[PDB]
Amino acid sequence: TPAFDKPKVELHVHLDGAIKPETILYYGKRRGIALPADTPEELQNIIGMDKPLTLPDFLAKFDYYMPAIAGCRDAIKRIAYEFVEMKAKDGVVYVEVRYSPHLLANSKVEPIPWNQAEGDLTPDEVVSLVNQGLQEGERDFGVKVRSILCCMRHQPSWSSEVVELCKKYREQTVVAIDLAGDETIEGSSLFPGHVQAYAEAVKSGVHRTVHAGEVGSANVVKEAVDTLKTERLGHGYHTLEDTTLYNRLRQENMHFEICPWSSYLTGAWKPDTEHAVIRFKNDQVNYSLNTDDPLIFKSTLDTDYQMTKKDMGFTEEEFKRLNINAAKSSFLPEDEKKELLDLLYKAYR
Numbered sequence: 001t002p003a004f005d006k007p008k009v010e011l012h013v014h015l016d017g018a019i020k021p022e023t024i025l026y027y028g029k030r031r032g033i034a035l036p037a038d039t040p041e042e043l044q045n046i047i048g049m050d051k052p053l054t055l056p057d058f059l060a061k062f063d064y065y066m067p068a069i070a071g072c073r074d075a076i077k078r079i080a081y082e083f084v085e086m087k088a089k090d091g092v093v094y095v096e097v098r099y100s101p102h103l104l105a106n107s108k109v110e111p112i113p114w115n116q117a118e119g120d121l122t123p124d125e126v127v128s129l130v131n132q133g134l135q136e137g138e139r140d141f142g143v144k145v146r147s148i149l150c151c152m153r154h155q156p157s158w159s160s161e162v163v164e165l166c167k168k169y170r171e172q173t174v175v176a177i178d179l180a181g182d183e184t185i186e187g188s189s190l191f192p193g194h195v196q197a198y199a200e201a202v203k204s205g206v207h208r209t210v211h212a213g214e215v216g217s218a219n220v221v222k223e224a225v226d227t228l229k230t231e232r233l234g235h236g237y238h239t240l241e242d243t244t245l246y247n248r249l250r251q252e253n254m255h256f257e258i259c260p261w262s263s264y265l266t267g268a269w270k271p272d273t274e275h276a277v278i279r280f281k282n283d284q285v286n287y288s289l290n291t292d293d294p295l296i297f298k299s300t301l302d303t304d305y306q307m308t309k310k311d312m313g314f315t316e317e318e319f320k321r322l323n324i325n326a327a328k329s330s331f332l333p334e335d336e337k338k339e340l341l342d343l344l345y346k347a348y349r
């Protein structure tokens with residue numbers, strides 16, 4: 001089978017989109033959750049998509065399974081730990097993982113998410129656990145792992161606590177900020193809570209990535225770059241609809257976090273169309289290949305790779321190239337990027 005049986009780097013995957021179904025059951029059946037069903041095959045098949053959906057229809061999934069994990073300490077710990085594992089079975093050697101800690105919390109968080117009750121798990125505490133899990137999972141599985149904390153676009157009130165967590169826990173495991181969920185709310189890239197957050201990030205040396213351009217216009221991408229000063233774009237596919245912006249982003253070596261399979265499944269790409277990634281490759285962009293949410297997309301990294309291999313003509317040399325871009329564009333300190341990259345090169349020859 002495997003499309004590209006070599007070392008990979010991955011930079012765009014959500015923790016809470018990367019949970020074993022079996023451990024969602026464990027925790028609902030534990031805590032008393034109630035769930036679309038009670039067998040893992042079923043379970044995947046319902047939080048699995050295989051069809052674009054409305055945003056409603058898509059967020060309701062997070063509504064079922066998140067309350068099995070959010071608020072539980074052994075759960076936060078365990079999903080982080082199990083994820084590292086998943087990724088080693090993918091052949092990843094370095095991953096950045098992102099998530100929102102407020103969306104695992106059930107205390108000093110307002111509004112409390114997921115219809116949860118309060119409870120004694122705070123946002124800060126969540127990231128302690130997660131990274132505990134990533135670390136020991138690093139130790140045992142052999143993947144080198146960092147984490148990215150996510151502001152949410154509809155909730156600029158969390159954004160500076162997001163920033164501060166990143167500073168508080170930086171270089172183990174947290175290496176950067178993200179901005180996530182729902183691009184389409186008007187002006188949200190320019191919400192003062194987000195833009196003071198990303199400026200604080202610049203001020204404190206934390207790395208920036210932003211969602212922009214999976215579902216929003218090229219205007220949102222230009223917001224990510226010019227106002228929030230991102231160093232990388234999550235997805236970025238709509239930047240193609242504005243060509244000076246595409247021209248300038250290709251020329252400041254801007255990194256795109258591509259997610260092929262994520263984008264058919266979501267509708268972000270219409271499948272009658274040049275997939276963004278083939279153009280991106282034709283133009284020699286800086287990009288990665290990425291999973292986004294394997295639970296939801298019924299995926300693995302090899303899924304992504306199979307797609308671009310079988311239907312987009314890609315090729316092991318690009319595969320090698322793009323993973324080398326991922327390593328160059330990682331949020332590691334340079335002494336360790338270079339260590340990442342020298343591993344990759346050796347492996348690639």
Ligand SMILES: C[C@H](O)[C@@H](CCOc1ccc2ccccc2c1)n1cnc(C(N)=O)c1
Pocket residue numbers: 014015016017059062098099100103150180181182183292293
């Ligand atoms: C960032 C977190 O790690 C988490 C957030 C889950 O809850 C949400 C909440 C609101 C949203 C509104 C629009 C789009 C996605 C949303 C995801 N998450 C997981 N995957 C995604 C995604 N694919 O967009 C976002």
Ligand SMILES: [Zn+2]
Pocket residue numbers: 012013014234292
């Ligand atoms: Zn994402």
